[PDB]
């Protein structure tokens, strides 16, 4: 599909058996999800943006389906206000910017 940017580019994703709305975010290196109790091992991480840093839990090799396009990779879970699909998964679904 083509998604214009008049509004926030929110799409449906599925992770850990939950459907969620997430921002397709070219400015995000990593994927950051709102607090959710995922099973598995994780590693602590700090990530920075506007306002400073938040603490997140890094989970690896997590399957994520984004608008019916399958992906699998690292997901960071923490107190973000919005679910953010970052470049680590955007590349996997063949997402590009075009103008």
Ligand X SMILES: CC[C@H](C)CN(C[C@@H](O)[C@H](Cc1ccccc1)NC(=O)OC[C@@H]1CCC(=O)N1)S(=O)(=O)c1ccc2ncsc2c1
Hey, which residues are catalytic here?
Answer: 25
91 binds, among ligand X, a second copy, none (CB under 5 to 8 A by kind): a second copy
* Alpha-carbon distances of 74 from 3, 7, 8, 52, 99, rounded to whole Å: 24, 27, 23, 22, 29
Residues sharing a CB contact under 8 Å with residue 62, sequence separation 6 or more, in sequence order: 15, 16, 38, 40, 72, 73, 74, 75
The contact set with a second copy (CB under 8 A) reads 1-6, 8-9, 23-29, 32, 47-54, 67, 69, 80-81, 84, 87, 90-91, 93-99
Instruction: Give the interface with ligand X as residue ranges (CB under 6 A).
Output: 23, 25, 27-30, 32, 47-50, 81-82, 84, 86
The radius of gyration computed from the CA coordinates of the chain, to the nearest angstrom, equals 13
Closest contact distance (angstroms) between CB of 27 and a second copy is: 3
Give least dist CB 64 to a second copy, A: 14
List the single partner that 30 binds among ligand X, a second copy, none, CB under 5 to 8 Å by kind. ligand X
Strands 32-33 and 10-15: unpaired
């Amino acid at each position: 599909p083509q998604i214009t940017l008049w509004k926030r580019p929110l799409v449906t994703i599925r992770i850990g058996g939950q459907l969620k709305e997430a921002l397709l975010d070219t400015g995000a290196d990593d994927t950051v999800l709102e607090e959710m109790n995922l099973p598995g091992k994780w590693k602590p991480k700090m990530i920075g943006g506007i306002g400073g840093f938040i603490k997140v839990r890094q989970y690896d090799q997590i399957p994520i389906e984004i608008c019916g396009h399958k992906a699998i990779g690292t997901v960071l879970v923490g107190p973000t206000p919005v679910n953010i699909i970052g470049r680590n998964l955007l590349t996997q679904i063949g997402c590009t910017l075009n103008f």
